[PDB]
Amino acid sequence: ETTALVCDNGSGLVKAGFAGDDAPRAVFPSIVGRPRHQGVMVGMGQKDSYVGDEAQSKRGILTLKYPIEHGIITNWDDMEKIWHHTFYNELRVAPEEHPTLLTEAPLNPKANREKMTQIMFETFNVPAMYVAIQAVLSLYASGRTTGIVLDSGDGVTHNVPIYEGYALPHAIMRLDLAGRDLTDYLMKILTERGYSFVTTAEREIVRDIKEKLCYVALDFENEMATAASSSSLEKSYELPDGQVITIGNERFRCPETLFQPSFIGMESAGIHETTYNSIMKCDIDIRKDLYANNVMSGGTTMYPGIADRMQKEITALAPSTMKIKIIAPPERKYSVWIGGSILASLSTFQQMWITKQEYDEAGPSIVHRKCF
Amino acid sequence: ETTALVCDNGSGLVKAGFAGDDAPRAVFPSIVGRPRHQGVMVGMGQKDSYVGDEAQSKRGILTLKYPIEHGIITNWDDMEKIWHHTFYNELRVAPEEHPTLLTEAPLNPKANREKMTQIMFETFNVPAMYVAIQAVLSLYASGRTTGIVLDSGDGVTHNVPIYEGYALPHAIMRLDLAGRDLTDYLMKILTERGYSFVTTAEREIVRDIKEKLCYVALDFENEMATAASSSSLEKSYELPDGQVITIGNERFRCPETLFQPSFIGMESAGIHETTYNSIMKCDIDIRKDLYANNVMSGGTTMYPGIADRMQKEITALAPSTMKIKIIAPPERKYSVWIGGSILASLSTFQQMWITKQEYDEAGPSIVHRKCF
Amino acid sequence: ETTALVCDNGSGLVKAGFAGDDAPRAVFPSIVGRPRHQGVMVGMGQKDSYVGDEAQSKRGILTLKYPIEHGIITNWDDMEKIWHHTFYNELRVAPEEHPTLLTEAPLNPKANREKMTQIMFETFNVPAMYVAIQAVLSLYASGRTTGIVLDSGDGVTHNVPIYEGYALPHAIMRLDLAGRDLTDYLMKILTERGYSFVTTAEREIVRDIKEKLCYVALDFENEMATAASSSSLEKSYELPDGQVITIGNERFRCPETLFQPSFIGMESAGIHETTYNSIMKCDIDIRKDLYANNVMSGGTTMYPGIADRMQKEITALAPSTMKIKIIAPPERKYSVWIGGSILASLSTFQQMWITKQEYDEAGPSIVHRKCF
């Protein structure tokens, strides 16, 4: 095929474009927004739903919903709006002409992948499609055939060990804590300095505070003490409406939830201990090359100082007789998409698409025998 | 010592008294009022501020300011008048002798608790003090150690899940909608029957209408349809000056803003979905016992029919396989003060006070290590 | 003496009682749990650690730890709590007074048996004690002196060939796969139907889903084809909180990990191949009588159909010329404790105890010369 789509149908943000390009043609919020107020002006574009950057622009009059929660599509009537928008509004393709790579977290419900397959063949009529694991696509962007990938988006953090191009599915870890839970935790702790952000539209203002100002502190208890001898670690943000909020230790106490999940009251290992536990579930001879090829992917891996702390923490867990290396590239915000754009372009991948002809003789249950 | 004080300095109404008493010694509006008109009579007790029942009595010539908004003290020089009035006028104590239990809503600004601590030790010179969460105190009055507490006052509604004595602070919810927002909404919908209530003194008249006549409809659309075949659900109230107002569906459409916050334009879950979401944020093993111990507290829970509406709605959200029970005691107007009167009286609590000697070696920051 | 104790301190279930009783006096989870949330109800039985049925009862607010992993005591400070609980809280004996039969898996670390001896003689001051192999104790409960015991608990599966009362230790097999690995795989594969169990208390919900509903298929690929023409093999289970989960092929696909360990990603023989390998490591004359006397033991041997799958699988490996019989008593859940109660009650065993004198002249190293 000349061109195929790769759609990274992520939680919170969707990345889309053509296989063989080096970056997404489109990136926009994975949001559908609906009016919450009385419409009074006739003779106007009174539209019953907005999606992506349209919903983000009009958000003061909208309730904003994400159809994807924790990497699982929880609203299919609105996920069809996000895929319709993706194909017809800023890729501006005919889906009937282009096969599509699609993207999923490990350990998802099987019904998610089946219903994602059924919609692509029966609503969008694609020639062929395939659903790929986000952490396998991250090694394609990095150019590896071995590494443990820590992929962390808006809804899920997951670890996938790979060695010599074989995955270890018994050692895959999933953690329902990534960018949305950090945004919600920042809304919670910003209340303690006096700022109430409570609506779905204000949740997007706090996501921008988090992205602009938050960081991961190399030693948290020393940083907490450094912020008690105050004013040096503080920054300020200017809200829509032009009011300013000053922000202090909540600037690094927020991303620490990744390393201390008990801040959001959940009982789990932190992301450093989840990467270590996943390496220690692997066969002993591969562990040396996994510690040396520790790949980071996805937007929740974009905090300043997170790779320095991930190296510090895996180095304290692992035996000191060997070298941990953290491979967090500057474009890792898109490595799942870039690696899907590599996979969908390979000549040896063109045999692996599920085709329309192969779906309509096997039903949506085809997707489990033909995809990892 | 034989007595501590306990003060529930809530929005709208202060409750004050001695630890181990059965009910508050003093209960009065959390109001300061100042003359809005020209004094002309020389040779009189002409006075620059009135507080509590003196403000409420003289209100026809006053502008009334509540110094607490949404559970946050917004006017500290008037809050010092309210604590001065509390201690010296109708408790008629000397704060220098009595340690005082104070009370706060969850998810408050930290500056509120610090400045309240500072006033208690540096302005009122108390021997010791503590700040307790209003919903944690409500279980002591109820005699539970497990339950989800809906507390709803004049300024704030909040849900605190507790199991076997442990709070789950991830599952705590705060909603900035309670009895003041329902008074302001009743003022607004009374305009549509042709009564204009607009001054701060008239807000008290509409608060008295809300207290005497309003109730929660068990099924709102059936009660709207009932009141449209009118005159059966209508009641009358006699204003000061003796003019009678007749009031109809606005009588139950006011309390319905607790279940439908969109009536006052705010995008949030009603008190039933806020309680159910707080139970569902808790660990799966405790939910069965939170549903059976759903405790209601504060004056905004005093409406006729709210326990029945709230049981009906949590029963519709919960799985049909188990028994929701709602514990709305008749003294729940005071269950925060009654609970604080138990707590301050316990022998095993006497280690927990912040003492003056421990404050003046740690500053007002002490209240974040000794209090929840 | 009148009575010894016998304590089968297994992984995740501790069985305890007196020699000559017909069944364990006490059975409880081999668990210690500590609070993970914040204590707010002052003046109550708040406590820093719960053990056994207290921990299993309060588990919604606790993180639950097992101090035995794969038959090895990994946390001695919490194993001392379990032995203290066993003796004082529901045997309610004086350990100073009764000699104790303890129990162990074969091919354990020698430090496990030494430290277990040292704790018994110095923390619990016992008169005398012994450590017996769980599989040898399973033959006493069966009335045999020859058989091969397949014992499978929570932590470890092991085969021990015995002929005319002599063990063949070169033919002993150990397999660090049993009931916990099956629970942890059921948590993994329930995720693919959309139920996410992840906390240490949700591991106890998935353990009951496994115990109530899981079973062993006689022909796995035929049962998989039977569950694909669905609904006949599905069952439903009600969780705490009253939600119901339906479960289908994951019902028999969980126990198949015993026959296909590659499901949990480990390279090993199944329990049938391990039993056949253990028989084939024995001398050629004894094999006829081992095939006729396969003894099932421990709780992971309790699935419906496991004895029929096991007899079908050993019959396919063994020569067709001779009788495979598998002996699977309904009391096999306790046969290690039952046969420990027999051993501890024999008049000929009363000279085989390690005594306090014989320990305190030889150190904890005494246990290697006097036990198996």
Ligand SMILES: Nc1ncnc2c1ncn2[C@@H]1O[C@H](COP(=O)(O)OP(=O)(O)O)[C@@H](O)[C@H]1O
């Ligand atoms: N510079 C940044 N710092 C912190 N967080 C970021 C940054 N950029 C993006 N994010 C967060 O990454 C999350 C989603 O990124 P992405 O990797 O696209 O996830 P998904 O694949 O689920 O769409 C968002 O919640 C966003 O807040």
Ligand SMILES: Nc1ncnc2c1ncn2[C@@H]1O[C@H](COP(=O)(O)OP(=O)(O)O)[C@@H](O)[C@H]1O
């Ligand atoms: N019988 C009643 N019916 C309806 N509302 C009431 C009743 N009694 C009191 N209220 C309302 O309760 C609110 C405050 O009660 P309270 O629980 O003391 O709150 P706070 O703790 O904020 O002072 C007031 O706004 C008042 O209007």
Ligand SMILES: Nc1ncnc2c1ncn2[C@@H]1O[C@H](COP(=O)(O)OP(=O)(O)O)[C@@H](O)[C@H]1O
């Ligand atoms: N009826 C049953 N079906 C399946 N598994 C069971 C059943 N009863 C108990 N088990 C499992 O047996 C395991 C432990 O049993 P037990 O033989 O006491 O082991 P241990 O000796 O290690 O305590 C537990 O993991 C439990 O889940």
Ligand SMILES: [Mg+2]
């Ligand atoms: Mg992603």
Ligand SMILES: [Mg+2]
């Ligand atoms: Mg109150």
Ligand SMILES: [Mg+2]
């Ligand atoms: Mg056992």
